[PDB]
Ligand SMILES: Nc1ncnc2c1ncn2[C@@H]1O[C@H](COS(=O)(=O)NC(=O)c2csc(-c3nc4ccc(O)cc4s3)n2)[C@@H](O)[C@H]1O
């Protein structure tokens with residue numbers, strides 16, 4: 220009952236009033252008043268956008284959009300790789316209550332069409348790289364009335380660039396000082412529309428309101444649950460802005476006044492060189508990169524003494540990998556957050572002063588969590604694996620034009636069934652075991668790939684691993700593993716199999732075998748492509 224529900228503590232300070240756009244405006248103005256403060260920095264080009272510049276461009280774009288005709292609750296879309304201009308339309312739209320629909324720049328035309336069919340945006344801000352595929356899909360979509368190019372200073376083939384759009388729809392000499400964003404109902408007005416397949420079905424549009432965002436803004440500035448770097452510190456993120464993992468970490472970074480160093484593509488040398496050169500103290504990565512930090516010798520070639528806040532998210536992180544990273548960088552521990560697109564941001568975060576190796580942290584302020592038995596549905600106590608369910612102020616309003624799917628993930632009481640298996644210890648630390656759909660069905664057993672992957676990652680010669688089940692007529696699914704080896708080292712199939720067998724019960728053995736590969740098929744936020752693993756392991 221109530222005794223088994225875990226609640227987040229009170230926020231260090233109460234929730235700030237206003238919309239997400241108002242809090243972002245106040246933050247940009249605030250840091251813009253300090254000389255030399257930089258908001259965005261492209262690691263590839265070394266170009267930067269100061270806070271003053273970002274305030275000018277977001278306020279001028281909000282005015283240009285209002286003059287153009289956009290009203291409250293209209294929708295725009297952003298299809299662009301990570302770059303300096305990405306967040307200009309996001310913040311400008313939040314200023315005036317326009318909903319933002321980020322769309323993966325790597326989407327095929329079919330995927331792009333379905334996502335745009337859900338959000339139905341009036342304006343699509345794209346990049347030079349995505350201009351052509353947008354032009355292709357737009358031919359089929361009547362609702363798209365305008366295309367703006369974010370990273371070009373000149374118009375291309377009859378399509379307008381950001382600077383010329385702003386110049387066309389806003390008067391030069393526009394006083395930014397006097398610009399004020401709109402005030403509206405933050406509990407009802409949608410801020411962003413994110414894409415997620417949820418737990419079953421095809422991709423859907425997740426509606427996140429301004430309230431959900433201001434809650435995240437509270438979190439990210441909380442002395443206990445927020446980033447542990449001071450305003451002006453440099454932070455490097457490799458997460459894509461179009462995903463909630465990147466979107467709601469970076470948007471909070473603006474409210475903290477950090478210098479956000481971004482990359483549109485992870486490259487080991489540019490990544491480490493950027494960390495040293497910008498004296499980065501915080502970095503946001505995925506488990507594969509945590510393994511890189513734990514085992515790559517290249518880490519020793521760069522001055523990373525400034526780095527102290529190393530965060531991971533998006534997928535299960537091996538306990539031992541985290542410990543190895545903390546140890547190598549002589550840190551008390553690492554940072555982690557756990558969330559879903561439907562919960563806007565991370566709902567379980569490692570709090571300040573409270574680390575527990577293997578645990579992704581504790582329930583964040585304004586949230587409650589529970590673990591329910593996968594059979595009886597009943598709540599469970601500490602150290603009992605079940606389906607993690609959540610409830611709180613960052614839960615989505617629902618899926619766009621799809622009440623059914625919303626009722627299929629948010630039950631009648633208000634609990635969001637995440638679809639992940641995990642547990643919580645006696646101190647309230649949560650542990651994510653793995654996604655339910657990822658569990659391997661070996662005879663009457665369900666083996667968690669993350670467990671075997673953690674074992675594989677304990678080996679000094681393995682830098683990455685992906686585990687899934689291969690079809691079998693008698694057993695159903697046989698656990699098998701794809702393994703990425705440390706350059707210069709070698710391992711046989713038998714070595715890996717015996718290494719795992721000596722540590723796990725008979726049901727978890729790698730009966731499907733082992734295939735060595737150059738990389739593990741994974742998504743941009745750490746999601747292991749199980750289907751691709753099976754193809755490889757066949
Ligand atoms: N930390 C984690 N540990 C284990 N598993 C994790 C995980 N995060 C996501 N997952 C998995 O991705 C699934 C959700 O996928 S999803 O729909 O595409 N959405 C997401 O993965 C998602 C949305 S927000 C977000 C995070 N925000 C953060 C902010 C700060 C910080 O320090 C860490 C984080 S993680 N992750 C989860 O159900 C879960 O299975």
Ligand SMILES: [Mg+2]
Pocket residue numbers: 414415416417560
């Ligand atoms: Mg999703």
